[PDB]
Amino acid sequence: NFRVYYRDDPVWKGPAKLLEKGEGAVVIQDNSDIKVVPRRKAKIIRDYGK
Amino acid sequence: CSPGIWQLDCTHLEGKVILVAVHVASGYIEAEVIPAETGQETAYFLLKLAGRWPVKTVHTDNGSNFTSTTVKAACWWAGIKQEFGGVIESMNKELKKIIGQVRDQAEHLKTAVQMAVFIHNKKRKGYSAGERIVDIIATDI
Amino acid sequence: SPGIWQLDCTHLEGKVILVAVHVASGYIEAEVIPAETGQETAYFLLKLAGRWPVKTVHTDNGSNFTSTTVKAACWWAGIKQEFGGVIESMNKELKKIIGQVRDQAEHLKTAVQMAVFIHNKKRKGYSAGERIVDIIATDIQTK
Amino acid sequence: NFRVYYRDSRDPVWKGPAKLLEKGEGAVVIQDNSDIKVVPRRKAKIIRDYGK
Ligand SMILES: Cc1nc2ccccc2c(-c2ccc3c(c2)CCCO3)c1[C@H](OC(C)(C)C)C(=O)O
Ligand SMILES: Cc1nc2ccccc2c(-c2ccc3c(c2)CCCO3)c1[C@H](OC(C)(C)C)C(=O)O
Ligand SMILES: [Mg+2]
Ligand SMILES: [Mg+2]
C-alpha cells in the first residue's frame, strides 16, 4: 500500500518498504538495510490508483 | 495489445526536448515540449496523462529520466507498471515529419508540435487515432 | 452536446490554474500556467483540441479568453467561442481536493494533477473519465 | 480559408482578422473592413482554418 522515498547524497532513494511510522521519524527497509529517517527526509506515498 | 499500454520517449528539435506518449493499440499521441529532460518533468507529464486515460503500463527505453525515482513515485501513486527495453520511435519520426510540414505556420516550436499532434490524431485512415482510442477504451469499460 | 467545453481560470498560491470541463461528463483537465494571458490560453486550447473533439468553448469575458491569440487558435482548430455555473462549481471542487492532498506534494502543480486524477477517476455508476469516453465513443459508433 | 492578424498604425495590439490577398516575400497584402493594407511579413500572422 505504501512506499517511502527518502534522502540520506541529494538524490532521492526508493521505493523503500515502510516498517513503522512515528511523529519524528519513519523506519524503512530498502533492500537488506533498515533505516531510521527523519520525517522531513521521507515521502510516504500510497498506491492510490492501485 | 492491451488498451492500457502506452509507450513514452523523447525526441529533439531546435535544441528543445519533446516528450511523446503513444497509446500503442490506437496510435493516438500526446506531446509536450519540456524545459529539461529530467525525471521531475517526466513524472509530471505522466501524472497528467494518467488523469486522462486508464494508463496501466508504460514502456520506455532506459533513459535516465524514465528510470528516475520521481517517475517511480508517480507510477506507484497512479498504479502504473513500468517496463523497460519501435512504435514510439516510428511515431517520433512521423511527428517530426508533420512538424516540418507546418513549422513556418507557427512562431514557437511548441505551437507546431501541438498542431502536428492534432493533425496526427484527427487524420482519418476509416477511423482516426483519436476516434480509435476512445472506441477502444469505451469498449473496455 | 458531446463537443461543448467550459474553460476558466482560478487561483491558488499566487499561481494561475487554467481548467477545462467537458460539460456533458464532468471530466476536467487543468494546467498551472505561468501567466493568465491569451498566449498561454491559446496553447492550452491547441493541446485540448488535439485530444478531444472540441466544437464549442464557453468562457467568461476574461481578457485572456477574448484575446486575439485564442481567436486564432479557435479558427485553426475549428472551435466556436461563446461568452457569458458548471465550471465555477468545478473550480471550488478542484480547490477542495487540492486542499485535501496539498501536503502530499511539494509543488502546487503536482497537487493540481493529483486532484484532477482523483476527480476524473472517482465513481458515482461511472467516473467522469469513463463518462467522457463513453459519450464520445457513442457519438462515433452510431454515426 | 485564411485569416490574417496583423499590427499596424504603430500599435502593438494585434488587429484583424483580415482577408489575405497576397503573401509576398517581405510584405503581405490584406483587406480589413474594405481597407487595403500592405504589412511586413514579420507583422503578419496568416492562419488557415485547418480544423474546418
Ligand atoms: C506567438 C503567437 N502570436 C500570435 C499573435 C496573433 C495571432 C496568433 C498568434 C499565434 C498563434 C495562435 C494560434 C495558432 C497559431 C498561431 C498557428 C496555428 C494554430 O493556432 C502565436 C503562436 O503562439 C501561441 C500558440 C503560443 C500563442 C505561435 O507560436 O505562432
Ligand atoms: C518534487 C518531487 N520530488 C520527489 C522526490 C522523490 C520522490 C517523489 C517526488 C515527487 C513526487 C512524484 C510523484 C508523485 C508525488 C510526488 C505525489 C503523489 C503523486 O506522484 C515530487 C513532486 O514533483 C514532481 C511531480 C514535479 C516530480 C512533488 O511536487 O512533490
Ligand atoms: Mg529515448
Ligand atoms: Mg474567469
Residue numbers in the entry:
A (entry chain C): 222 to 229, 232 to 273
B (entry chain D): 56 to 140, 149 to 188, 193 to 208
C (entry chain B): 57 to 140, 149 to 188, 193 to 211
D (entry chain A): 222 to 273
Sentences from the paper on this structure:
Integrase (IN) is the retroviral enzyme that is responsible for the insertion of the DNA copy of the viral RNA genome into a host cell chromosome. Allosteric HIV-1 integrase (IN) inhibitors (ALLINIs) are an emerging class of small molecules that disrupt viral maturation by inducing the aberrant multimerization of IN. ALLINIs bind with high affinity in a small pocket at the HIV-1 IN catalytic core domain (CCD) dimer interface. Projecting from their principal binding pocket on the IN CCD dimer, the compounds act as molecular glue by engaging a triad of invariant HIV-1 IN CTD residues, namely, Tyr226, Trp235, and Lys266, to nucleate the CTD-CCD interaction.
Following extensive screening, we were able to cocrystallize the CTD-CCD fusion with two highly potent ALLINIs: BI-D and PIR. The BI-D and PIR containing crystals diffracted X-rays to the resolution of 1.8 and 2.1 Å, respectively. 22 and 15 residues of the interdomain linker region were disordered in the BI-D and PIR cocrystals, respectively, suggesting that the linker was free to adopt variable conformations throughout the crystal lattices. ALLINIs share three chemical features that are attached to an aromatic scaffold: a bulky hydrophobic group (chromanyl and chlorophenyl in BI-D and PIR, respectively), a tert-butoxyl side chain, and an invariant carboxylate (shown in blue, green, and red, respectively). In addition to these well-characterized ALLINI-CCD interactions, our crystal structures now reveal details of the ALLINI-induced CTD-CCD interface. Within the buried CCD dimer interface, the chromanyl of BI-D and the chlorophenyl of PIR engage in hydrophobic interactions with the side chain of CTD Ile268. Thus, the side chain of Trp235 engaged in stable T-shaped π-π stacking with BI-D, contributing as much as 3.43 ± 1.1 kcal/mol of binding energy. Moreover, according to the FEP analysis, we observed that the CCD residues Gln168, Thr174, and Glu170 were favorable for the recognition of BI-D, whereas the CCD residues Met178, Trp132, and Thr124 were favorable for the recognition of PIR.
